[PDB]
Enzyme design. Structure first.
Site, PDB file in Angstrom:
ATOM      1  N   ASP A 176       0.778  -1.197  -0.054  1.00 55.82           N
ATOM      2  CA  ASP A 176      -0.071  -0.163  -0.085  1.00 55.82           C
ATOM      3  C   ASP A 176       0.963   1.327  -0.122  1.00 55.82           C
ATOM      4  O   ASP A 176       1.587   1.547   1.002  1.00 55.82           O
ATOM      5  CB  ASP A 176      -1.063   0.003   1.311  1.00 55.82           C
ATOM      6  CG  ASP A 176      -2.084   1.029   1.060  1.00 55.82           C
ATOM      7  OD1 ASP A 176      -1.762   2.126   0.498  1.00 55.82           O
ATOM      8  OD2 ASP A 176      -2.909   0.869   1.960  1.00 55.82           O
ATOM      9  N   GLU A 179      -3.226   6.082   0.260  1.00 58.58           N
ATOM     10  CA  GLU A 179      -4.504   6.146  -0.249  1.00 58.58           C
ATOM     11  C   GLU A 179      -5.088   5.210  -1.129  1.00 58.58           C
ATOM     12  O   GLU A 179      -5.756   5.409  -2.040  1.00 58.58           O
ATOM     13  CB  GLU A 179      -4.477   7.580  -1.196  1.00 58.58           C
ATOM     14  CG  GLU A 179      -4.296   8.774  -0.438  1.00 58.58           C
ATOM     15  CD  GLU A 179      -4.156  10.092  -0.987  1.00 58.58           C
ATOM     16  OE1 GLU A 179      -3.963  11.180  -0.306  1.00 58.58           O
ATOM     17  OE2 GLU A 179      -3.942  10.047  -2.361  1.00 58.58           O
ATOM     18  N   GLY A 180      -4.912   3.873  -0.832  1.00 56.14           N
ATOM     19  CA  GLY A 180      -5.173   2.525  -1.575  1.00 56.14           C
ATOM     20  C   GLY A 180      -4.596   2.452  -3.041  1.00 56.14           C
ATOM     21  O   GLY A 180      -4.927   1.688  -3.638  1.00 56.14           O
ATOM     22  N   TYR A 262      12.693  27.438 -30.470  1.00 52.86           N
ATOM     23  CA  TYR A 262      13.524  26.796 -31.543  1.00 52.86           C
ATOM     24  C   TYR A 262      13.145  25.356 -31.974  1.00 52.86           C
ATOM     25  O   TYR A 262      12.341  24.721 -31.139  1.00 52.86           O
ATOM     26  CB  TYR A 262      15.281  26.810 -31.313  1.00 52.86           C
ATOM     27  CG  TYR A 262      15.374  26.137 -30.063  1.00 52.86           C
ATOM     28  CD1 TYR A 262      15.690  24.740 -30.232  1.00 52.86           C
ATOM     29  CD2 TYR A 262      15.334  26.779 -28.833  1.00 52.86           C
ATOM     30  CE1 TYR A 262      15.986  24.097 -28.956  1.00 52.86           C
ATOM     31  CE2 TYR A 262      15.740  25.779 -27.662  1.00 52.86           C
ATOM     32  CZ  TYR A 262      16.107  24.640 -27.784  1.00 52.86           C
ATOM     33  OH  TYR A 262      16.406  23.975 -26.325  1.00 52.86           O
ATOM     34  N   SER A 275      16.073  19.909 -18.919  1.00 49.61           N
ATOM     35  CA  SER A 275      16.051  21.502 -19.180  1.00 49.61           C
ATOM     36  C   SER A 275      16.122  21.668 -20.842  1.00 49.61           C
ATOM     37  O   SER A 275      15.660  22.598 -21.343  1.00 49.61           O
ATOM     38  CB  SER A 275      16.184  22.269 -18.230  1.00 49.61           C
ATOM     39  OG  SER A 275      17.658  22.499 -18.288  1.00 49.61           O
ATOM     40  N   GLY A 276      16.806  20.450 -21.170  1.00 51.19           N
ATOM     41  CA  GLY A 276      16.963  20.672 -22.789  1.00 51.19           C
ATOM     42  C   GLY A 276      18.594  20.762 -23.117  1.00 51.19           C
ATOM     43  O   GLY A 276      18.664  21.200 -24.208  1.00 51.19           O
ATOM     44  N   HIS A 280      26.185  18.821 -28.694  1.00 49.44           N
ATOM     45  CA  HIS A 280      25.617  18.231 -29.903  1.00 49.44           C
ATOM     46  C   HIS A 280      26.601  18.933 -31.002  1.00 49.44           C
ATOM     47  O   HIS A 280      27.344  20.202 -30.879  1.00 49.44           O
ATOM     48  CB  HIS A 280      24.361  18.813 -30.283  1.00 49.44           C
ATOM     49  CG  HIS A 280      24.074  20.092 -30.218  1.00 49.44           C
ATOM     50  ND1 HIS A 280      24.317  20.800 -31.461  1.00 49.44           N
ATOM     51  CD2 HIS A 280      23.604  20.990 -29.387  1.00 49.44           C
ATOM     52  CE1 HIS A 280      23.839  21.894 -31.094  1.00 49.44           C
ATOM     53  NE2 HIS A 280      23.354  22.140 -30.118  1.00 49.44           N
ATOM     54  N   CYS A 298      22.535  24.993 -25.158  1.00 47.44           N
ATOM     55  CA  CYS A 298      23.419  23.751 -25.390  1.00 47.44           C
ATOM     56  C   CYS A 298      24.851  24.136 -25.809  1.00 47.44           C
ATOM     57  O   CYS A 298      25.070  25.188 -25.816  1.00 47.44           O
ATOM     58  CB  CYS A 298      22.977  23.284 -26.634  1.00 47.44           C
ATOM     59  SG  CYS A 298      21.088  22.261 -26.613  1.00 47.44           S
ATOM     60  N   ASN A 300      27.436  23.669 -28.060  1.00 45.07           N
ATOM     61  CA  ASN A 300      27.510  23.539 -29.490  1.00 45.07           C
ATOM     62  C   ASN A 300      29.175  23.289 -29.328  1.00 45.07           C
ATOM     63  O   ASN A 300      29.891  23.951 -28.850  1.00 45.07           O
ATOM     64  CB  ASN A 300      27.658  25.004 -30.172  1.00 45.07           C
ATOM     65  CG  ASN A 300      26.073  25.334 -30.479  1.00 45.07           C
ATOM     66  OD1 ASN A 300      26.112  26.164 -31.351  1.00 45.07           O
ATOM     67  ND2 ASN A 300      25.191  24.785 -30.001  1.00 45.07           N
TER      68      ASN A 300
END
Ligand code: NA
Ligand code: NA
EC number: 2.3.2.-
Length: 351
Positions: A176, A179-180, A262, A275-276, A280, A298, A300
């Site tokens: 449990d 709350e079930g 973007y 958060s992205g 890359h 990012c 780059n």
């Protein structure tokens, strides 16, 4: 000459019997001559009697919302005893399924937390923590901390030692969780810590330096977030990697059509924040890499360096960002766990 005695793990007429453990019957002053347990529909439940005849147990998972009937007979030199018991198991209001990361059998970096993500809000966080058994070898102290209402993390004070085995048994079936809401099933994973790989991006130099077991192996010119959309400082955990990915800012709360929005297809992308933020390939900014920040956050790098990063960095390795004009990555980002001070993490937030 004593009459045999029967001891069952349930009581006749019980309700709310939990299915996180088998049902058993034990004989004293005699041996079990017959044990059967059937459900409401008359189907037999699988069980096994010990070779010495003293203990019988169920051997398959028992069901929620059942009514079971147990019949047992014990025989001894002193006589016989028979009992019939009927009981009802837990009736959940809801089920929740756990999902565990990292993957079973994976080799991960020294920053990888254990992650248990439930598909529902957990009302009783303490019950969930209690049901999660984490084994480490060499053994190390760790603790649980909730990133949100559905996902809990476990990690040590410091980065893992390479060569550590980590085992995660999420024993939530029959439990449990408040709350079930009961566990839909158990889950399990096992993983191992590999080499120490820590990459540091320093805004003062605009270089991303990769260190493997303390040695510099690569030095990558980078272009990070421009002043109006800077890259946060702090410790980032490496997540998933992609040969190519369409980065869509709406995934991270920002409408594509808005000023900081973007949508961009990029190659050789390694995710380091929910958060992205990614490392890359950025052929359009090679001129600025090592000199000026131009991105939305990012890191780059050149196509060759992004592919190198993809090939040589793994889930759970570390990227640390320092000296940017940004703030600090939130500890509850999803890959920001190490920015929470140990005293706060250790104290937890189960409530
Ligand atoms: Na544990
Ligand atoms: Na390794």
């Amino acid at each position: 000459l004593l009459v045999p005695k029967l001891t069952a793990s349930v009581t006749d007429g019980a309700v709310g019997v939990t299915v996180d453990a088998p049902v058993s019957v034990t004989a004293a002053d005699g041996v079990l001559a017959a044990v059967t347990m059937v459900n409401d529909n008359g189907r037999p439940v699988a069980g096994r009697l010990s070779p010495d005849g003293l203990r019988w147990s169920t051997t398959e998972q028992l069901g929620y919302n059942r009514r079971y009937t147990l019949n047992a007979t014990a025989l001894g030199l002193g006589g016989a005893a028979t009992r019939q018991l009927t009981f009802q198991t837990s009736s959940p209001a809801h089920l929740t399924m756990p999902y565990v990361m990292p993957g079973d059998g994976e080799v991960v970096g020294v920053g990888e937390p254990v992650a248990i993500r439930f598909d529902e809000n957990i009302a009783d966080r303490g019950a969930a923590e209690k049901a999660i058994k984490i084994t480490t070898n060499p053994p190390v102290e760790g603790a649980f901390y909730w990133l949100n209402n559905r996902e809990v993390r476990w990690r040590p004070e410091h980065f893992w030692k390479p060569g550590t085995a980590v085992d995660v048994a999420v024993n939530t079936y029959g439990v449990d969780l408040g709350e079930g809401m009961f566990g839909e099933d158990n889950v399990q994973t096992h993983f191992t810590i590999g080499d120490e790989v820590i990459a540091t991006a320093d805004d003062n130099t605009k270089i991303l330096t990769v260190r493997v077991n303390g040695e510099v192996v690569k030095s990558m010119p980078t272009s990070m977030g421009k002043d109006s959309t800077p890259t946060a400082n702090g410790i980032y955990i490496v997540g998933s990697r992609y040969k190519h990915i369409i980065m869509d800012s709406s995934t991270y709360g920002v409408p594509v059509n808005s000023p900081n929005g973007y949508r961009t297809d990029v190659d050789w992308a390694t995710q380091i924040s929910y958060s992205g933020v990614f490392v890359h390939s950025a052929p359009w900014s090679v001129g600025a890499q090592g000199h000026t920040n131009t991105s939305h956050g990012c890191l780059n790098v050149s196509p060759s360096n992004a592919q190198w990063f993809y090939d040589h960095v793994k889930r759970g390795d570390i990227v640390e960002v320092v000296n940017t004009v940004g703030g600090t990555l939130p500890g509850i980002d999803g890959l920001g766990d190490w920015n929470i001070p140990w005293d706060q993490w250790r104290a937890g937030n189960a409530k």
